[model samples]
Target: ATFEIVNRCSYTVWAAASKGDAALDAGGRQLNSGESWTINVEPGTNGGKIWARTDCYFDDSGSGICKTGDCGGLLRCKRFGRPPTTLAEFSLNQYGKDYIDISNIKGFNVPMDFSPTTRGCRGVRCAADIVGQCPAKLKAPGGGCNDACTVFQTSEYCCTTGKCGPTEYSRFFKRLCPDAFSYVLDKPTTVTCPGSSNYRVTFCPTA
Candidate 1:
């Protein structure tokens, strides 16, 4: 499958695309303004996720931590990144359809837009600028917003009991990015883009 990541944000973006426990697209790559990277995703790729890392500094050996979304403190991430990041999650050829969504279930840092290469596919986006609007408690000092589950860790906040419903905290994220996943039980967020040949992920997609 053909996959493309576009950086529309003003500043540079570090992209990490992965499936399972292995990195895709050369592990971690820097995408400058208006720059994009394309790679092929093999079929049967499942539980794959793509995320952005910011405020990072790496060394020649690809060893160093990032200010936000640090994936095991390494430039080449063989695992998922830390929280307070905007994630584009996907499951390909699932039930004969490509299901994709921009997930904030782990909290959010950047705006994202997701779409397919097909003509009839609809573009899904969660471009809410939540940095300034982030609640005081969930706010990260440098950037991004942490999920209530990460901060509070209560049964109610984490939805561990399964009986818990949306609190004011969940509403806070829902109100901003209604199209994205806001809580543990969040549904109706996946976009059905029938074709799986190609997909596009854009950062800071406006209008």
Candidate 2:
């Protein structure tokens, strides 16, 4: 009945999701080892993006920053996560199906999995150890690999000029996560499922 968030990491992680008429609110917070939280969606709601924050320190007043995937130091995120974070995004009920994508076009600070829990639906994920093998130019300030677009900021990397496609750096991510969106124009990255089907988001699902 709802989207589920699972923590497969050894330590605790601050999970986050977007908000609106179609977002996961309260339940997208902290999760410890092997723990999971379910956030039901509104019947007519569309969808939202989900990510995780790492190395975060929030006081009782909810004032602090996360080493990765921060949301302006707020506990309940009112905005999208910052760079160097992987994103699991979806849109429900449009085109008679749900579309899901795990995007690292912004960058990658965590290994993740996003897949339908429904028996007939397929799944998609990125489980490689990208942080350690990350190139220096594509390294994020906090941790993990930065997308080529973030490092170069040019049309060649950002696809701003035209149909600019994947570069060598983009291939690096593609090699690791062939199913996810690794660049501005990464093709065939979206996965479709029945609109009513719920999905699972897991951190370090393979690590």
Question: For this target, which candidate reaches the highest lDDT against the unseen true structure?
Answer: 1
Off by over 4 Å in 2: 19-23, 43-47
Name the lDDT of candidate 1: 0.82
TM-score of 2: 0.92
After superposition of all CA atoms, the RMSD between model 1 and the true structure is 1.5
Task: Give each model a TM-score.
Answer: 0.94, 0.92
The residue pairs found clashing in candidate 2 are none
Task: Report the Cα lDDT for residue 134, model 1.
Answer: 92
| Candidate with best TM-score | 1
lDDT of model 2, residue 54: 88
Q: What TM-score does model 1 achieve against the real structure?
A: 0.94
Candidate 2 residue 87 Cα shift, in angstroms, is 0.9
Residue pairs clashing, model 1 = none
lDDT of each: 0.82, 0.80
- The true-versus-predicted C-alpha distance at residue 68 of model 1, in Å, is 1.4
What does candidate 1's lDDT look like per residue over 1-207, in tens digits?
Answer: 777999998887788878748987576777888999887766667878888888888888888877677888788777888888888888787767777888787888878998887666677788988877999999987689998998889998788888778878889999999988888887668877674647899989884
Shift of residue 130 alpha carbon in model 1, Å: 0.6
